[PDB]
Design a binder for this molecule. Structure first.
Ligand code: CLF
Ligand code: CLF
Lengths: 520, 456, 456
């Protein structure tokens, strides 16, 4: 049934944006609305279409000048807020570009300023030959023709390539407008314009991955070990030119269907490339995904070998945390796909109880996925506002919340710990090792001795003041049995602080080897 | 003075005007602003304040979409005010901050205020004290500094009301940290001077309490703002962050205004205290001589041994950056580059900048700067020992191996920098010792005469 | 627990007993000690205190030479007392601290005191209040920790006198910084508790005044020490630096003594405040709940993101080092090595150490350690993220690229560390944030996921 919040009675439109799973209901009984306009003044969590296009999908590309046509403020506001890394020395994190539109450019036109800014950026970074121009609110209203300027700059330089993304912040209800716009733009302008140099025997496009803390590198490692060529990645750790070659892959391996399903559906409709939805998170979802990809190419035995090896290495460590986390309650509050990527896997493989999910921008498809994969009684919210979140916490009493940084700092002031669902904490959270890293983060947040200390009132007359120390393991062992506590097979996470250094230093070795053989 | 020759931006130093108006608004008790425009315009600013403070602050949006831009979006603001007021019954001040989009299309938010006060407030919130104001912040003008300056002017102009005279002064702090306000309030309390402090941002640091939840908020009240008209005088520390409000008070209510100096370092703190002493009649007491002496003893331990002849690049909010340059010169350091990151035309007329040009010989001042100014000068051969700046220039520091002291806004890559002063004598001691310790850690990382840190 | 297997020292962690007695003595107002022995025994200690504090303290020598060793050197002490008292007319307390040389040859300095008070003081300083005492500090026993502990006992035993009862408690702080004493005095003042603080070392940090020179000195008076006998109770924070004086007060004057905990971190500060509340009858007030909440909010920002699972080696003064280990365990870090740098036999029976052994799994405790313990374990493959220790272990940190937070005594390679607390809630916030910032600077120096310092 549709859940109406006490804080949202005055805005009755909010009633049909929340459901509570009930026994005897299916997807055709009730379903929260989605991808609608925001109610003004609600202090919702939603962003703008420029965010969805530029900040989320565009910037991950590693060999590109990302210049926003607009004032400095849009460019500053999205700079150094994301954790998509690259093997291009993180160029996409360290350099950001604006045309710096002033009032004279608003009144008289900013196209000359855009052309001059593009030439300046190419001049300052002569090793970069690719560029994307993003519209902002300002330059989208006044009608600047960015496409004509991009054509002029390309012909004046003769060795650069420019992509145009016309996604101003107001052009849509949330980041989702940006997802759609940039997908269709890249497909229509850029796909098919470059031919691959080498095409191996099993070629995939890895679609919908943005390399948060090295998530893509983790997945590339697995594909290398199955002998699968990743032609391009959309767009984490992705290069401009490889993404122009997407029309030549045997299979589209889609991870985030909220942000990249558009290009996948259109590549399927145009070039006949099949679309295979996968999970990167969890042990069993990731194992099944690897099995499907290897099965498509007839190389199943390679996937099974990876899976057995990874299970033997990481399953004992994951089960150490799973034993200590059984029954703990969590609120799953990302923006998009991570709510249905995690809801079932976290309950099964860490023992947590998912009491609520929400999406900031997701459509009704994300909610039908999320409601399906959640248990009965879970609260599913679309376009949540701050007061609704407070009410949900007071009703559900979660032990941890997975949400954003600023929402996390809010719920901290209501007693609850948080893990960053967006940027991770000690990521990457993808892979088999990554799931163990996620479990350790959950366990550290929940069983912190500092959390119990903060709950203690020292001015209370008979206050339970103690001395010495406690550890998280002391706190968590109070919840397990003797058989679990003295198990000789379960042990804590044995991994480096930077798990990606060794993974990246392996993907690069593989690349070198493959090049050697090919060039011979 | 060098004006940046490029027209585009590579790595901006500041954000836009609406962000500054939003930051000024969160310093007022029972105030939630509505940013009129796209949702990104408010969500990113809340994230940016969160990066600096590691706290969450309530700011609302009118959520302008495509139909709002094409058809007009004043109905969005009317809906936003109603929704915000019904759902937050403790709110008394609602500033309506415009953005680039609604400044371009010409949404008449001033006229809407009149209608709201005549129709919506008396009808659906009868007897409730609600004050609405507009802050016009076109992001293609100025920067977050000018947005902050304008918002302080707008808040004062809304509320200041002539009444019985008060012995208080007005202290407009400028854009400062909670640690800075604590230091300034300590100075005033030793001098025995009551002030209307704009703004009281110590409560930005909220405690993690056992039972009673307690969120971050500002502590400047409507009564503080109302009483600004009755003060003996106004001291605005920052000429670019509060001189407009002070000029308004002088012109409208004849409240004498003293602009600056920013009390960065020993000498400028003395000048600030002398201004307070002249305004109020209160003598500088012997306790301040002692606290000043303590800061000077710390500085003497490190000054001509470690700080003399160190080459420094500085960027911050303009007033803080200029004051930091002056303090570094007093410490015998060699400031090489000063970055003033926006297009304000008052910098070249600023008496502090004219004095820097006269007597700081190897210092280059770049107005309308971005971070590519600093980085491309290092690539061309500028050698620095130290950088003073905020966190968005951290990759220059990381990649070129120049240590940086985190000052200004935002400093998100170090823990708890908002709790330490850079103003006053306490701030001078904190600043000088942090510079020394940053340099010490760098010598040890590079093994650069690191054996010398034994009998200094 | 591992006892060091080597018999010689490579890179000692502590110095000898007389240095500890000298450090205890400089905390008393109008006290200049005479170190009975070689000139190096006093000159090096003055230099070492100077390294920590960057200040000069007056300690005298009896200047024993070859003829003073072969023949008796008690005439040197008699001359030293006369010379010191004639040339320093403000001195009231003169402790005679022995060294290794005069402990070996059996100079009877106790018997000499009787003669001095019967002959020299009444004759050549008639009516002057002069108190002489001996502190026996054979450097081939114990360490500077045991020397400090013995000197505090000796000062209390000299002066404590039964009189009218007092509502005060005795707070024997142990060997702490001026910043630590300020924090403890702040806690007591909020609790509304008066104390005889042993010692008042805030005046170690002296100001650089315009006109009247003012040198560093201690502020514990003879009256404070006299009144120790009339207190409601004694709280000795450090079991190895003040439990002997507290045991004496209980045995002699029936003053109840509470030993520990060292208030390092949140939990041990709570226990200290509860001890104060039990002793005095004074409730813990709501202001302390708020200051505790502020420290916890800072810790929550960094705890399970950056401090959890960090591998730490710790050495300091024994009580501080053990308390730091407990705080690190509460912060979810993994202490790997704890170095207790002298031969005290109480460590293995210390209930704090027994608890560490029970519930800190991967922690090795080395008693009678030197720095080669830490360094040779790193060479054999011990991996650390952080070190907590004082400055004499700096080359381990520099050469093996392990960042270090400077705690304890002496911390001479960083500026102003004596002014920051490690005790109380303020010290806990300072400690945790300094550890985070040390780690942050290290990630940037090594480019170790340094991009992660943006949205934490
Ligand atoms: S320069 Fe400044 S931050 Fe930019 S829009 Fe303008 S006021 Fe705002 Fe806003 S919604 Fe997104 S972030 Fe922009 S494209 Fe518009
Ligand atoms: S005059 Fe010179 S420094 Fe003095 S002892 Fe003699 S050789 Fe040495 Fe040594 S151990 Fe300590 S510091 Fe002394 S009391 Fe003995």
């Amino acid at each position: 049934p549709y859940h109406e919040f006490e804080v949202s009675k005055c805005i009755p439109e909010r009633r049909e944006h929340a459901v509570m799973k009930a026994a005897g209901e299916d997807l055709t009984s009730c379903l929260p609305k989605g991808y609608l306009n925001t109610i003004p003044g609600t202090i919702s969590e939603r962003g703008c279409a420029y965010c969805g296009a530029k900040h989320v999908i565009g910037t991950p590309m590693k060999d590109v000048i990302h210049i926003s046509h607009g004032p400095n403020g849009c460019t500053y506001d999205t700079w150094q807020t994301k954790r998509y890394i690259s093997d291009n020395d993180n160029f996409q994190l360290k350099y950001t570009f604006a045309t710096d539109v002033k009032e004279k450019h608003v009144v008289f036109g900013a196209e000359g300023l855009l052309k001059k800014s593009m030439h300046e950026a190419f001049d300052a970074f002569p090793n970069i030959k690719r560029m994307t121009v993003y519209q902002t609110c300002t330059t989208a209203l006044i009608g600047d023709d960015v496409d004509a300027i991009a054509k002029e700059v390309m012909e004046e330089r003769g060795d650069v390539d420019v992509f145009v993304c016309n996604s101003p912040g107001f052009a849509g209800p949330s980041q989702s407008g940006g997802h759609h716009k940039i997908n269709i733009a890249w497909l229509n302008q850029k796909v098919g314009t470059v031919e691959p140099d080498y095409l191996g025997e099993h070629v995939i496009n890895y679609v919908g991955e943005y390399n948060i803390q090295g998530d893509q590198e983790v997945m590339i490692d697995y594909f290398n070990r199955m002998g699968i060529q990743v032609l391009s990645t959309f767009t984490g750790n992705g290069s401009y030119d490889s993404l122009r070659m997407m029309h030549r892959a045997h299979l589209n391996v889609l991870e985030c269907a909220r942000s990249a399903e558009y290009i996948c559906d259109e590549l399927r409709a145009r070039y006949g490339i099949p679309r295979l939805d996968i999970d990167g998170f969890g042990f069993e979802p990731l194992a099944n995904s690897l099995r499907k990809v290897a099965l498509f190419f007839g190389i199943e035995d390679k996937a099974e070998a990876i899976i057995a090896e990874e299970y033997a290495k990481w399953k004992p460590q994951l089960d150490w945390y799973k034993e200590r986390l059984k029954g703990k309650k969590v609120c799953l509050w990302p923006g998009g796909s991570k709510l249905w990527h995690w809801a079932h896997a976290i309950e099964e493989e860490m023992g947590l109880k998912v009491v609520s999910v929400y999406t900031k921008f997701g459509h009704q498809g994300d909610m039908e996925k999320g409601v399906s994969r959640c248990g009965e009684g879970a609260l599913a919210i679309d376009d949540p506002n701050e007061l609704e979140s407070v009410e949900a916490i007071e009703m559900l009493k979660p032990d941890i919340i997975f949400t954003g940084k600023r929402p996390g700092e809010f719920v901290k002031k209501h007693g609850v710990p948080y893990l960053n669902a967006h940027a991770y904490h000690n990521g990457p959270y993808k892979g088999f090792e990554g799931w163990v890293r996620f479990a350790r983060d959950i366990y550290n947040a929940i069983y912190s001795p500092m959390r119990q200390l903060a709950a203690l009132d020292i001015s209370a007359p008979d206050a339970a003041i103690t001395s010495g120390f406690r550890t998280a393991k002391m706190n968590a062992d109070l919840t397990v049995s003797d058989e679990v506590k003295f198990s000789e097979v379960l042990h804590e996470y044995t991994g480096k602080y930077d798990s990606i250094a060794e993974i990246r230093a392996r993907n690069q070795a593989y690349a070198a080897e493959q090049k050697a053989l090919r060039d011979a | 003075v060098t004006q940046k020759a490029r027209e585009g931006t590579i790595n901006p130093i500041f954000t836009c005007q609406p962000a500054g108006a939003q930051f000024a608004s969160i310093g007022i008790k029972d105030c939630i602003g509505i940013v009129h425009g796209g949702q990104g315009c408010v969500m990113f600013v809340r994230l940016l304040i969160s990066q600096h403070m590691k706290e969450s602050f309530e700011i609302a949006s009118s959520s302008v979409h495509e139909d709002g831009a094409v058809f007009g979006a004043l109905d969005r603001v009317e809906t936003a005010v109603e929704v915000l007021l019904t759902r937050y019954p403790d709110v008394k001040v609602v500033p309506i901050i415009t953005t680039c989009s609604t400044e371009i299309i010409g949404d008449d938010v001033d006229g809407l205020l009149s209608k709201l006060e005549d129709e919506l407030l008396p009808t659906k919130f009868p007897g409730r004290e609600v004050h609405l104001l507009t802050v016009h912040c076109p992001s293609f003008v100025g920067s977050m500094i000018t947005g902050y300056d304008k918002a302080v002017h707008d808040f004062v102009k809304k509320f200041a009301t002539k009444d019985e005279p008060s012995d208080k002064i007005n202290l407009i702090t400028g854009w400062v940290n909670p640690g800075d306000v604590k230091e300034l309030k300590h100075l005033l309390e030793v001098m025995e001077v009551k002030a209307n402090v704009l703004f009281e941002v110590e409560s930005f640091d909220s405690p993690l309490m056992p039972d009673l939840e307690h969120h971050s908020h500002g502590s400047t009240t409507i009564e503080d703002l109302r009483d600004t008209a009755n003060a003996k005088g106004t001291i605005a520390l920052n000429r670019y962050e509060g001189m407009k409000a002070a000029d308004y008070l002088k012109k409208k209510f004849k409240v004498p205004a003293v602009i600056g100096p920013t009390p960065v370092g020993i000498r400028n703190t003395d000048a600030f205290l002398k201004a307070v002493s002249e305004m109020t009649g209160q003598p500088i007491p012997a306790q301040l001589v002692k606290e000043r002496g303590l800061a000077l003893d710390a500085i003497a331990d490190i000054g001509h041994m470690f700080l003399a002849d160190k080459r420094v690049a500085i960027y911050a909010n303009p007033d803080l950056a200029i004051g930091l340059t002056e303090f570094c010169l007093d410490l015998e350091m060699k400031p090489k580059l000063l970055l003033l990151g926006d297009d304000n035309s008052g910098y070249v007329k600023d008496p502090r900048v004219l004095a820097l040009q006269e007597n700081a010989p190897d210092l280059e001042i770049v107005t309308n700067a971005d971070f590519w100014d600093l980085e491309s000068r290092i690539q061309q051969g500028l050698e620095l020992d130290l950088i003073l700046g905020h966190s968005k220039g951290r990759f220059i520091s990381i990649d070129y191996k120049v240590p940086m002291v985190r000052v200004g806004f935002p400093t998100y890559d170090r823990a708890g920098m908002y709790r330490h002063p850079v103003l006053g004598y306490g701030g001078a001691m904190f600043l000088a010792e942090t510079m020394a310790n940053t340099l010490f850690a760098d010598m040890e990382a590079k093994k650069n005469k690191e054996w010398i840190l034994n009998v200094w």
